C-alpha cells in the first residue's frame, strides 16, 4: 500500500501538527515550532539532541517526510524511530539515535544504519552503496511498516528497501538526533494505511 499512501492527498497542517514533534518529548535544547511542524536546535556546544513525534505506531503502514537542510547537518544527523524510552540528549556529539536498544536510525551524512551501535561496524544503506557516493537530499521519506515490522526510507519517488527488521510488537515514534546549532528539521506526516 505504499504507492497508494504516497499518491493520496497530502495531510493538512492540523494532521501534521498532531503527528509532528512533541514539545513534551524532546531535548531541553530543542524548541518545537508551529505546534509540531518543525523544531530548531539551540546552539549548545558538546550536545546531541533528539525529538520524538507525538504519536507512537504499533500497527499499520506509516510514512512521513523529514526536511533537513544539507548545510545544517554537521557531524551527526540521524533519522529513524525510537521507543518512548530512548534517551533524547547526551553531552557529546554522536549518533545518539541508534546508540541503544531503544532506537533505529540512518546516518544521512554517512549512509550507515545504527541500532545498539556506537558507529563502528554499522552497515551501509542502501545495500551495497558507499556513503561518499551518495548525498541524501534535503527531503527524505521515512516508511515504517508495523505489519511486517520494518523501517525503510524513500527518496525522490522511490523506496530504497527495508533497512531494519524485527520491529513488530513495539510502539515506535518518529525520531531524529541532531548536533548542529540552529538546525531546523521539519516533519510532515503523510498518513497511515
Amino acid at each position: 500500500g505504499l504507492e497508494e499512501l504516497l499518491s493520496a492527498p497530502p495531510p493538512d497542517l492540523g494532521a501534521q501538527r498532531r503527528h509532528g514533534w512533541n514539545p513534551k518529548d524532546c531535548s531541553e535544547n530543542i524548541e518545537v515550532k508551529e505546534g509540531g511542524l518543525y523544531f530548531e536546535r539551540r546552539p549548545v556546544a558538546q550536545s546531541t539532541d533528539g525529538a520524538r513525534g507525538k504519536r507512537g505506531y504499533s500497527r499499520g503502514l506509516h510514512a512521513w517526510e523529514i526536511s533537513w537542510p544539507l548545510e545544517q547537518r554537521g557531524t551527526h544527523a540521524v533519522v529513524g524511530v525510537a521507543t518512548a524510552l530512548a534517551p533524547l540528549q547526551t553531552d557529546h556529539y554522536a549518533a545518539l539515535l541508534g546508540s541503544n536498544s531503544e532506537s533505529w536510525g540512518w546516518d544521512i551524512g554517512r549512509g550507515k544504519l545504527y541500532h545498539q551501535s556506537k558507529g563502528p561496524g554499522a552497515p551501509q544503506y542502501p545495500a551495497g552503496t558507499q556513503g561518499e557516493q551518495l548525498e541524501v537530499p534535503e527531503r527524505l521519506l521515512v516508511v515504517l511498516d508495523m505489519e511486517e515490522g520494518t523501517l525503510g526510507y524513500a527518496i525522490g519517488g522511490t523506496y530504497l528497501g527495508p533497512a531494519f527488521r524485527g520491529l513488530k510488537g513495539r510502539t515506535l515514534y518518529p525520531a531524529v538526533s541532531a548536533v548542529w546549532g540552529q538546525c531546523q528539521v521539519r516533519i510532515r506526516y503523510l498518513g497511515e494505511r
Binding site: 546552539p43 556546544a45 558538546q46 557531524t75
Partner: peptide, 9 residues
C-alpha cells in the same frame, strides 16, 4: 569562544 557544529564558542 567557537565550536564546531555551529555551536557556541
Amino acid at each position: 569562544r567557537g565550536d564546531i557544529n555551529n555551536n557556541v564558542e
